[PDB]
């Protein structure tokens, strides 16, 4: 619409309707040039890894949009507004918008660097909306829109990998060419704009329960369904075998016939978070639960959605089982505990078993008394991983404000219940990706031809504004609880600092990571 | 097919901003105390990344060289097989669950 | 509430309106880093504002006979005019001027 023209406005707010909420989200986003206009050939045979870290894949000069954080949408306060409210979520609908896009030239001579604009370049946007390219959202990678709005964002590098043996490739590893699809091109004057309509997912549960599972039952009145309670004599003068039968009484309830079982388990090691209670080896990898894949291991981390400790031991957590997410000031490599924070699934004990215990015990023999003079003591053993059974029930992994959104489900045949196991939204047409690069301007040309392919072009990036709007429909609390609710609150103290906002020297920082169970609703 | 595995579906090129325990001992190695030490996701290490989904079920079967002379000298076709157990009467699986018949190179 | 400082106390005032530059950031690195942006193209902006106001007025009614006191500027020769520039170009206001200088009955 021209260059004196804005092709948008900041459009960052939150609106509250009776069951939807609607959050819009503006940044200011700079994109590079990556690989100089190349695309390159990546894998692990130079890095000489081991054998589960092995990979093959490309490098795109390609950057993305990812919007894949509930942090990117949501203030803290409308987070806390949104949990401590409604019994559960889910998304709608968004629009996408790209507007205010500036080229800058770059040159560096003597040490001193020009910048200027470059009012006839452009930038290569598209869609992804046949999900073509290898989907790298869902990752919980870093590039993210920032939590806080007036932070400037560099727009994350596109790259994949494909099917490798070892470090090297097979004849079904694909090569995806970007300039292959159809590419909007947007001068300084023009804009991007893309809608898309979630899929009816259900509803995120920003609730606890109110009962455990295997607590369901009246306490006042007995069953009508009786139980083997005793083999032996119970006067203990001799000890002669028997077959006595109980009742189902309040005051057995461990022995009381159910209905339900807890949801599946697959067991971590527990460690815990007083480094002088825990073993003196390394044993994050030789002692973790991880799984088999074409001859190459994976730590499952977080896998099944457990609870992380039982009562009265918030001093342990699962290995690798829980969502853990730095602070600022938190290194790349070997940081701290003080530098990490842990999330805690303390509100699915209800119905989930503990990350860190087994499932339960199984007969594993045939008991028999002496004859064949051989007698046979009854035996159990210990049930550590345990898939989904008949009657079991389960809570999903909760979402957080620095969590991820959603996830793609991986096309295949067959998938058990395809919610992610980072938690969030599982989606068979998830949000598109939204790739962005710099369209080459190639320097001065030889006077001669050369057939060569250019490899010297004019150095330049391009900034611009960036606008995500979500509608999400809400799904109101409906509770006949007397008693008040646990809520997410503000410490009301005298703080050197505000949580949630910046310091003197301008860093916004996130004190804790924020889940949505506070609301409770019975089993 | 699938161009792509189960446990490569990551952007080789960004961090991740998921943190996991990488060290419970001291990396110095000087003295041998215990810590917790943790690290961000990263494509150097890709077998220790968070990931959403898990690979399919399995219900593990022998291994049977197509070179005899790597075989076990036994016939083990029966009592060295995955079979169940229906009425007090046992049933080989053949072929069961979905899943790749072996390794690379191999 | 009239406020202390003498005006108009409003319940709702005339909303502050707020005007910043959009950030635009310099050369970012060849490869991509989560750190949040630090250099930026230093600039600055300028511009025109225009402000129109309609005030009512409420005129005086006075029977009053003999002549009123008024503002006034004082005629003499003097070295500069009241509320103008100096020879330096600096323009200066000499005096506060108040409100209250016709009367009305009590």
């Given at each position: 619409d021209g260059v004196g023209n804005a092709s948008g406005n900041w459009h960052c707010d939150s609106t509250w309707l009776g069951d939807r909420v609607i959050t819009t989200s503006t940044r200011t986003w700079a994109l590079p040039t990556y690989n100089n206009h190349l695309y390159k050939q990546i894998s692990s045979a130079s890095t000489g890894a081991s054998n589960d870290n092995h990979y093959f894949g490309y490098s795109t000069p390609w950057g993305y949009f990812d919007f894949n954080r509930f942090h990117c949408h949501f203030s803290p306060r409308d987070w806390q507004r949104l949990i401590n409210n409604n019994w559960g979520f889910r998304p709608k609908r968004l629009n996408f918008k790209l507007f205010n896009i500036q080229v800058k030239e770059v040159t560096t001579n003597d040490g001193v660097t020009t910048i200027a604009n470059n009012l006839t370049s452009t930038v290569q946007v598209f869609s992804d909306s046949e999900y073509q390219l290898p989907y790298v959202?869902?990752?919980?990678?870093?590039?993210?829109?920032?939590?806080?709005?007036?932070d400037v964002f560099m727009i994350p590098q596109y790259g994949y990998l494909t099917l490798n043996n070892g470090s090297q490739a097979v004849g079904r590893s694909s090569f995806y060419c970007l300039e292959y699809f159809p590419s909007q091109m947007l001068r300084t004057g023009n804009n991007f704009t893309f809608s898309y309509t979630f899929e009816e997912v259900p509803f995120h549960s920003s609730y606890a329960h109110s009962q455990s599972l295997d607590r369901l039952?009246?306490?006042?009145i007995d069953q009508y369904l009786y139980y083997l309670?005793?083999?032996?004599?119970?006067?203990?003068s001799a000890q002669n075998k028997d077959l006595l039968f109980s009742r189902g009484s309040p005051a057995g309830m461990s022995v009381q016939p159910k209905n339900w079982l807890p949801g599946p388990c697959y067991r971590q090691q527990r460690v815990s978070?007083?480094?002088?209670?825990?073993?003196?080896?390394?044993?994050?990898?030789?002692?973790a639960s991880k799984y088999n894949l074409n001859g190459r291991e994976s730590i499952i981390?977080?896998?099944?959605?457990?609870?992380?400790?039982?009562?009265?031991?918030?001093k342990f957590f699962p290995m690798s089982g829980v969502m853990i997410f730095g602070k600022e000031?938190?290194?790349?490599?070997?940081?701290?505990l003080d530098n990490v924070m842990i999330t805690d699934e303390e509100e699915i004990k209800a119905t989930n078993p503990v990350?860190?215990?087994?499932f339960g015990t199984v007969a594993v023999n045939f008991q028999s008394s002496s004859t064949v003079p051989f007698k046979t003591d009854p035996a159990t053993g210990d049930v550590h991983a345990m898939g989904a059974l008949p009657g079991m029930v389960w809570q999903d992994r909760d979402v957080y404000?620095?969590?991820?959104?959603w996830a793609k489900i991986p096309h295949t045949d067959g998938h058990f219940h395809p919610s992610p196991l980072m938690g969030g939204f599982g989606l068979k047409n998830p949000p598109p990706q939204i790739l962005i690069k710099n369209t080459p301007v190639p320097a001065n040309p030889p006077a001669e031809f050369s057939?060569?392919?250019?490899?010297?072009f004019i150095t330049q990036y391009s900034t611009g504004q960036v606008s995500v709007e979500i509608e999400w429909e809400l799904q109101k609390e409906n509770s006949k609880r007397w008693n008040p609710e646990v809520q997410y609150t503000s410490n009301y103290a005298k703080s050197a600092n505000v949580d949630f906002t910046v310091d003197n020297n301008g860093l916004y920082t996130e004190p804790r990571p924020i889940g949505t169970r506070y609301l409770t609703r019975p089993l």
């Open positions: 959202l869902g990752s919980a990678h870093q590039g993210c829109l920032p939590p806080f709005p007036a039952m009246n306490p006042l309670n005793r083999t032996q004599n119970q006067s203990g978070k007083t480094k002088t209670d825990n073993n003196n080896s390394n044993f994050t990898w030789t002692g981390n977080p896998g099944t959605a457990m609870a992380s400790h039982k009562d009265d031991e918030d000031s938190a290194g790349a490599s070997n940081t701290a990350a860190t215990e087994r404000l620095q969590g991820p959104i057939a060569t392919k250019f490899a010297s």
